[PDB]
Design an enzyme around this catalytic site. Sequence first.
Site, short mmCIF file in Angstrom:
data_model
loop_
_atom_site.label_atom_id
_atom_site.label_comp_id
_atom_site.label_asym_id
_atom_site.label_seq_id
_atom_site.Cartn_x
_atom_site.Cartn_y
_atom_site.Cartn_z
CB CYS A 114 -0.91 -0.04 1.22
SG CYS A 114 -1.44 1.59 1.78
CB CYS A 171 -4.92 3.28 -5.07
SG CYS A 171 -4.38 1.69 -4.40
O1 LIG Z 1 -2.57 3.57 -2.07
C1 LIG Z 1 -2.43 2.36 -1.78
O2 LIG Z 1 -1.31 1.83 -1.74
C2 LIG Z 1 -3.61 1.52 -1.48
C3 LIG Z 1 -3.58 0.18 -1.09
C4 LIG Z 1 -4.89 -0.21 -0.92
C5 LIG Z 1 -5.69 0.89 -1.22
N1 LIG Z 1 -4.90 1.93 -1.56
#
Ligand SMILES: O=C([O-])c1ccc[nH]1
EC number: 5.1.1.4
Lengths: 335, 335, 335, 335
Positions: free
Chosen positions: B91, B256
């Site tokens: 993450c 993300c």
């Molecule tokens: O931004 C991230 O690494 C992430 C992992 C799960 C949801 N977002």
Amino acid sequence: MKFSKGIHAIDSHTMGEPTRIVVGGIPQINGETMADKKKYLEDNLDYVRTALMHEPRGHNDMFGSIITSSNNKEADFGIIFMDGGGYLNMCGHGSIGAATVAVETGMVEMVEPVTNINMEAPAGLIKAKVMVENEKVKEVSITNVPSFLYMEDAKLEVPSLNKTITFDISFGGSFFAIIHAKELGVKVETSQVDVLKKLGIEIRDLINEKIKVQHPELEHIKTVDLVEIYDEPSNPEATYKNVVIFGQGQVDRSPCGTGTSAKLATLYKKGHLKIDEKFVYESITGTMFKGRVLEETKVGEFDAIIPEITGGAYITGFNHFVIDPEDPLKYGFTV
Amino acid sequence: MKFSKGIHAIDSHTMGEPTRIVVGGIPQINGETMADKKKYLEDNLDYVRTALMHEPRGHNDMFGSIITSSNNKEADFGIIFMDGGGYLNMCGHGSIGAATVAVETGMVEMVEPVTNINMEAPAGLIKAKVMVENEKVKEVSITNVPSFLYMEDAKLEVPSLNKTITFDISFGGSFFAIIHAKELGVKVETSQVDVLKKLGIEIRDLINEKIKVQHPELEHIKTVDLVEIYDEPSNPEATYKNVVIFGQGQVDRSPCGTGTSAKLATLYKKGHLKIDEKFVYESITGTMFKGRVLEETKVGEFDAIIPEITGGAYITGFNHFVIDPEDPLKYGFTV
Amino acid sequence: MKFSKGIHAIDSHTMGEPTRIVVGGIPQINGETMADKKKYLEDNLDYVRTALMHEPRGHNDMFGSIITSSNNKEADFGIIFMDGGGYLNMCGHGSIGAATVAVETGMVEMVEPVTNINMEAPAGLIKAKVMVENEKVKEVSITNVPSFLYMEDAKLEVPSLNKTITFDISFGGSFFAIIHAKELGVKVETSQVDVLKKLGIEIRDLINEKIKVQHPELEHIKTVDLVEIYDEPSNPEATYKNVVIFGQGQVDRSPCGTGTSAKLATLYKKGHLKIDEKFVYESITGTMFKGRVLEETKVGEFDAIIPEITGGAYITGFNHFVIDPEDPLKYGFTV
Amino acid sequence: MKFSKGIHAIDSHTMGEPTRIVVGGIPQINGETMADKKKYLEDNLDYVRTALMHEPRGHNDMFGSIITSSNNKEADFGIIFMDGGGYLNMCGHGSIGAATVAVETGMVEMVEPVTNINMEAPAGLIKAKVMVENEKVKEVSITNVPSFLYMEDAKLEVPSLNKTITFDISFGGSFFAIIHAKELGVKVETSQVDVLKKLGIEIRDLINEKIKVQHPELEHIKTVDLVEIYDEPSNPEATYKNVVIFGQGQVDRSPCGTGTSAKLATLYKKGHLKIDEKFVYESITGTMFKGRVLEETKVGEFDAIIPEITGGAYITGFNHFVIDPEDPLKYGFTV
Ligand SMILES: O=C([O-])c1ccc[nH]1
Ligand SMILES: O=C([O-])c1ccc[nH]1
């Protein structure tokens, strides 16, 4: 690490609905009356509410209270209820948490049989019988503002969808719409929480647009801030399930103390309840409050009742909330 | 006040998405490797995760991480990502938060041009360039696990509704499903966050029932834990809006990192991205991450890439999270 | 607010003598063995010790301990004792404090009859029997390093004043100079604490100058870091009053632990004690420890014993200690 | 963990002399006037003072203040000084601490050139000019109660030893017994802090026994609660070294604020100081205050002056102080 501002507060939960109780982030709030103190806040330090009730520090739903200097006689300290929307005039789960935690921390010096706590609250006074079992708080019997039946059923009209009919509205600290889940055809369950949400708030509003909302005293409220939908309980105990939609589309995890005290004034004036006679109210989670009617009272111009709600809260953490003045969400955001 | 157990943990926020970083609740976690430390947790202290991620302390969405003794060489300390659902293999927003806050609290003795942090993570290592402007952290370039295209459009079939066709899958620490918002006809906005949420988790499941999920190395992952929906941005900067659904039906407020480091490997292998060439990914909020491809690498059996994700976090509280052993929700609930 | 660094630590007190336990202000310290951790600290982060043990955050006297990653087998976490002066090889009131708080906070999951805790320490291992009364920690039986009688009396010479004669020296984790208060003519009481202080540190020094200080094993200690003065107790219970002077001229509000374990050896080898047989030691405050001899052992070259010390600590506060980098005394000062 | 009461309080240091500022452990204390608050405390919650200022939590020396509700006009909040002894009616180190931290934490919303703070205090009002360097608090000019020369020298008599002569007495908030270090023959240094301590309190007492101690106004102080001993400074800057003895035999690590505001009035009325003209006072540590005379005033019966003391405090930690009701020293002890 730069910060500028540092808020101290105590995270509780009354029947799953979170209360975040403020302690040390400010030493002083003038206001005067506990409605004036609320107006002051709103029109001045709303930035504290938003910052702590919104993300990232909080969430949609999420709920909290400020512990004040009282000014008032008889009442120890004074309470201002806030939420993801605004500043609730009165809140049972809140009152409960506040009191639980006051005693717990020893801000109050605890009395063994029970501990009486007289709190301010934007709408009238409140008293909390705080049961303590030598060592602990076992639960809390808050006695509420005069609740009453307001407007007998009255037709509703809901654009989305159909345009239904019967439902009742009642006071209990705020103005609740009490409508049956058969009336609009909803299942008061986890499944539909969000359709309930958008249904609730859509009613609340288009109710708030074209009605007569008024307390024949205190003369400030004049709003239907709350929507209570109820139906038969899929718990053996409890007389009904209710779910309570409020503040910019959030949903209460408890049965809503103010929502039960309102509903109790709209039984009774109905016949189905006699003074005392245990009422139990089921939330939308699996949690239950022990309501009951206490006495009769005709508020300002029409008959009413003063009801006693009886829940219990737990401490779920201590916070030094801080704001990095770089944090471009330093005063929080919604969705 | 009785409490039995007392957890220390610093609230952060990367790009809106919360990261609650645990510090001082426990003085030992054996595990061994930072996959073996995640299993240990999963199978043993899951009560910690649920308590903190789930109400009343946390919420649906909400995310966090455990700072661990390293064992490993090079690396300072070791990270374990946890969520409303489970324990994310990797993450970005988390790794960002964890670095920002390691320096900001002066756990890491800060170096002035930039600070280099090597953290463990369940899936490979990660290095954070931490940009500090004499005093402050200005932002963070995390360089991720080898990302890559996996399968390629392939069979879809969605029961609710219609039963569509094209969509891609790819690895970026975790396995992302990358499907266009035109493909299932959703608007990646606030409006529909929930329909996106139920859409996402339904695909994620029925995709995980009937497919080949496998990393040719590390030989533990073998799962599509994540669903990336993307479309044309309604922000002038950023090449696409994406919204990421994961862990028991929760949605990422950031674009993300791992979702962007995935989606970079499934351009490039596509042509539409050259090594370097600034990628900017817009989240479902209004927030953006500065991604870009760094180098080529064939992982185990098939060609790939190693990408660099650039974002930034802010501290938003310090907590002594306590559990009243009378608190019947003392290990917390969902909805 | 601006701080750079942010230490987490829990304030306890073991029979009046403060023990400040450090938790979250670092996630790592390499050292290796719990002597090579103590040296690492001593010769790298002395600026933690001074900052916490010295003013303006601590005081003359004052004492604290670091909770570490173990490395070792059996032993949960690892302990590093620190004082106004330096890093104490072993301490009873520390080991107690450390254990009490580990359990109490829930860094150890508590076992009901008793909880066993194996801690590292810079001088061997130690085991604490943690008596828990269903809910609480009642007290703690720490089992201590092989104590013994070292050098039979020996002549002292004191410049101020006269120049006296007899007094014994022993080991019990560190090397104690046991001398009777009739020997130098002091009243181990409130009245003369400071003349005791300066009498103590003058002896300790001029003893350390012209003696043979040596453990036959471990081969690193070779020092008399401690002075124990004792006399007939003005408390009915307890066999003696002692006061203990150490580390840069400070005084121990508890009977000392290591000081009692020492003194026990130098009864016994004297005949006035039989294996078991309750010893109780009075402090220089009105507080008491429950000591007793467990078993015989001849350390390396000469005869000895392994004693058990029994006390009990209390939590007195939680600290997020911080250092404003502008605070010119950031690393603290003495007098 | 079990804890009766839970006090929120911020540790500071003003020039080395500790100020521990209380915040959240109470929401209320009636009193009325910021003397009648101090009395209420003194004759009710002296179990707070003792717990915090004494061991094991505090020490000999040590000092701290309560942040209150004001009641008063103009004044933000209200301050109640407290020390190992009792409740100082006014103190510079405090009023500085209290202001620095109020801004620094954002209890006061800071103003950029300088912030003005009006605080209550047992002895009149005080105003603090708080210099803020865009980001920080640079330092604080507190303006102090009408200081003045009381009783020209007057003969002392000191039993141990000889029985000497000249020494002056003054007011600056409290009544200071200014005597030269040549007069009794003491070196205002580390070397003799404790002989100074016992010399001071012994003078303070036998001075309080056989003198005329009276403020012509306010009509409640009538005491010499302070002993200033001064001599040529072995720092280049600063006109003199002073060390200040008070409250149950504790010593002040700063020059004393009140003690400088006093001493200023007893230059000037002496001819060795003109309105303004930088006075700098050295402490018994290496630390200094920047004092000066603002304006003339003849208090009630005799001539006087209103001075301005300038220092600067720093935050040194955040406390949730907690008392285990089992802790036999819950309310703390002395020596
Ligand atoms: O931004 C991230 O690494 C992430 C992992 C799960 C949801 N977002
Ligand atoms: O718990 C309550 O009484 C409440 C107030 C608003 C929603 N619920």
